[PDB]
Subunit: 379 residues, 3 copies
């Protein structure tokens, strides 16, 4: 089978009270356990996603101009005028121009002259934000395998109890572990794609915008050139200007209002006072083949997918970091407890390597993998 | 009496060490317990409030103009000038105007001409922000009832120990549970009222402002119109323009610098090694009358106040959510553990319902309440 | 020796499972423990620091102007022009001027005239931001004293296990306790110094800037004055203008990209099922001399350094707060558990006093210290 049991160290049983157990369910891993003559337990992180996010600031990449009107005056005729100077639907430019007999204007000199046009945006991109009323983890408690119940847990209401047969009441109690600062990050949506970019950056892009109907610095796209006895220019469709600008950007698969994420959660189960069964896996001695190259993740860590070539399943996977210097730093491992359930199922490791030149080591003895990695750290 | 005891699952007692107990005190509920021949225990959340918040950005809704001065020139007399063009106490507009014999000006043509006025705001509204040095929970430990001690716990210093007679030392250890992102929300104050609005929104309101003395884009209120051989206009008192704009806004009762909130906290008591008494209430079978209609809360959840019509007190209150689809999602309940202490005391439920059309169910069997609710999610 | 053991209340031992122990390691204090015939344990907070922070917004305090070019026209010659009006490397001002025979210009009147110059900043100051990929605590587990292992723990990956001889596996599990909202605070760097200021403030300083190469509102420094038959002014080096502005600012020692902080952490050790040894120190009766005056800290608390004059070592240090009113508030103490290890080693206390006039009390009976303190709370 498929799921990983709990070690000896991560649950307590009080003479009285109950059995409190720690758990870090991760994106793509299930955790397991049982007591005597009680059926097995399976705890799995169904998925993490955010739905229905606020609209933070709508931006016009590409707009058209309508109903264009001027009024100019001769000299000694004062400033040209137009009611439209009040409506924030028109950009309008007031310049001064030259009138001669060259335009029905008796005298020489320079004549006031203003000119407007309706500004109408046609392609808008959206910057959105995520609060607690948008996050939800879906979480499986399943009791060979069978029926399973689905707890759904949130930032606002992270306590679920659950009535498991053979085991009785069980409260879950969860909190995200390894992720994103939606306090710094906006979700960006241009037509069919969603990127994910640092707020400040987002808020600083040269364009007409609107508080998530009335545009702002419309002029950024619509301009006026040399007036004659005026004409208004404009830059094109922005799709392209951007795509080149969103270049470094974490990309995301989204659908409508839902958006899915690779979630780490971290819970503690509280259930009636029970002697569970710990397991403490034997440390591995086969060697590890790299399956597929070391990728960055979008919750900030670095995934590496190994493949175990020995007769050990199951076992703890010996792993190790050094920095440029060469120093073992004893940490930097997201995937707290990375164990070979069964060969043939390559195994993931999520680690947060240090800045600069990092040396990851997987495996015991010779034939251990030694990856270089590189890190460098801006917006 | 009045207070709710602890279940069997939420405290442990180690052979050695001590007795660690979980607790979620909520706005408007007390939690209770005791051991053998030891007097009872009462833990109550005195109140949550924030005091003395930073001033983030002072905005002028309504200002007056003073000491208004111009200087214009004829043609061939160069640009008009005024020292005041340096002081950011005056808005000043430089235009060009027409001089004839119509104003003591020998020749025809257009003459430079500038004009100023002291800008003096008279009604300011304030946007404030909340950090850790502003939050405080007040919390009661009381040991029929008697004397009680008041722990006061903060974001910065959430550990209080406390010397209880009959029970000995007891450390509390607390953290907010269900609330507000003061990282996204500003406290807004216009004259006598305090609203509570999303930062970005706030920062985007068309008005003169100042970093919490020198105004900025003063012009937003003060304008100049057609100059004559100039005059400066201005929009009125803003109270009203706003009140219509703060429309969706969560309103708040405030007093001076204090501001009070409905707080959820979540602690763990650490006290010397003790066999406490759990209670695990019987699940309710009376039916529930809705007392007062389902209100939104300002910490984001949805309160519903029920009333129990059966001979059961005490008992657990069977409750249940479905989404539009119809699916039981097993969670979404803020008021972790909602129990009938005694009839006649209607009971609250705080739940965080999903987006769209939600079906809450309270009660076991027929005669269970089934509310519809609606949700939709922007700034 | 030097390190402080664990009390009776802060670790549990389950019949089965293991030994979970609470710990708040603080900047400048080590925590200690052991079981029977097992060697002693030392847990010490190596240090907290942030490295390699994003660049949030680069600001030009002081720039120079280059390659300055105009083109003006006579009347009936239309607007002056220059290709450079497109390049955001030049600030350029278009005015109107006067042409007579005073400059080779046949007729009287006012003539269009524009003028540019390359804007080149020469001193830039930087505003930076801190996310999880920048924080790291270094933490010592040492087992008279000996060899010690250094766990390094982060916001993203706060779980380290560690193989201690005599004690076996031990997982640490940590989270900052008392600190800074890098969500509100920017790290500021002008030449050789680093300050630390509230984001909004930072984002609001009058100057050319750039998203962490193209300046913005260059004009803030570079101006044009009365054109002749034009000339461009500029304010000076900003070092000084600022230093007076960064006045209230928390100052910081930094080096390159590293920046060090006084860290509080808060962990829980999880190790195989063990009867540890608690100690519960006797409450002190000597009196306390103030060693060095009560300083503010930059994680927001107030440090006070006492000195114990009695034959008690070791003992708990009786301490107590009142507000202006006079009320004992039972909390406000950061240094959860402040104990006299040995006289001659003055002792720190970190406390978060209330707003207004605060009365701290250290010591039992007469000869107890009673400090006044003052608090007041903006940006
Ligand atoms: Cl003229």
């Amino acid at each position: 089978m498929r799921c990983v049991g709990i070690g000896n160290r991560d649950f307590v049983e009080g003479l009285s009270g109950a059995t409190w157990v720690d758990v870090v369910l991760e994106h793509g891993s299930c955790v397991t356990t049982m007591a005597k003559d009680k059926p097995t337990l399976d705890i799995e992180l169904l998925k993490t996603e955010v739905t229905n996010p606020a609209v933070l600031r709508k931006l016009c990449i590409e707009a058209k101009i309508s109903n264009t009107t001027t009024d100019s005056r001769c000299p000694t005729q004062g400033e040209a005028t137009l009611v439209e100077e009040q409506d924030a639907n028109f950009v309008c430019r007031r310049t001064f121009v030259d009138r001669g007999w060259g335009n029905g204007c008796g005298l020489f000199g320079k004549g006031s002259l203003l000119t407007c046009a309706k500004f109408k945006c046609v392609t808008k991109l959206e910057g959105k934000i995520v609060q607690y009323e948008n996050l939800k983890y879906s979480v499986i408690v399943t009791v060979t395998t069978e029926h399973g119940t689905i707890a759904t847990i949130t930032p606002q209401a992270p306590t679920s109890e659950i009535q498991l047969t053979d085991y009785g009441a069980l409260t879950l109690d969860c909190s995200p572990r390894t992720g994103l600062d939606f306090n710094e990050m906006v979700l960006l949506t241009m037509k069919e794609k969603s990127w994910l970019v640092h707020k400040q950056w987002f808020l600083d892009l040269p364009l007409p915008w609107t508080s998530g109907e009335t545009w702002n610095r419309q002029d950024l796209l619509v301009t006026f050139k040399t007036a004659h006895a005026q004409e208004a220019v404009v830059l094109g469709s922005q799709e392209g200007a951007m795509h080149t600008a969103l270049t470094g950007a974490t990309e995301i698969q989204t659908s409508g209002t839902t958006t899915i994420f690779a979630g780490h959660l971290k819970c503690r189960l509280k259930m009636d006072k029970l002697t569970l069964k710990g397991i403490s896996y034997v440390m591995c001695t086969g060697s590890f083949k790299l399956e597929k190259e070391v990728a960055e993740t979008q919750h900030g860590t670095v995934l590496v997918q190994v493949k175990y070539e020995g007769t050990d399943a199951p076992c703890k996977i010996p792993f190790s970091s050094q920095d440029e210097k060469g120093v073992t730093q004893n940490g930097r491992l997201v995937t707290a407890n990375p164990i070979v359930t069964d060969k043939e199922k390559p195994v993931n490791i999520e680690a947060e390597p240090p800045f600069g030149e990092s040396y990851i080591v997987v495996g015991a003895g010779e034939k251990a993998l030694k990856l270089s990695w590189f890190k460098k750290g801006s917006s």
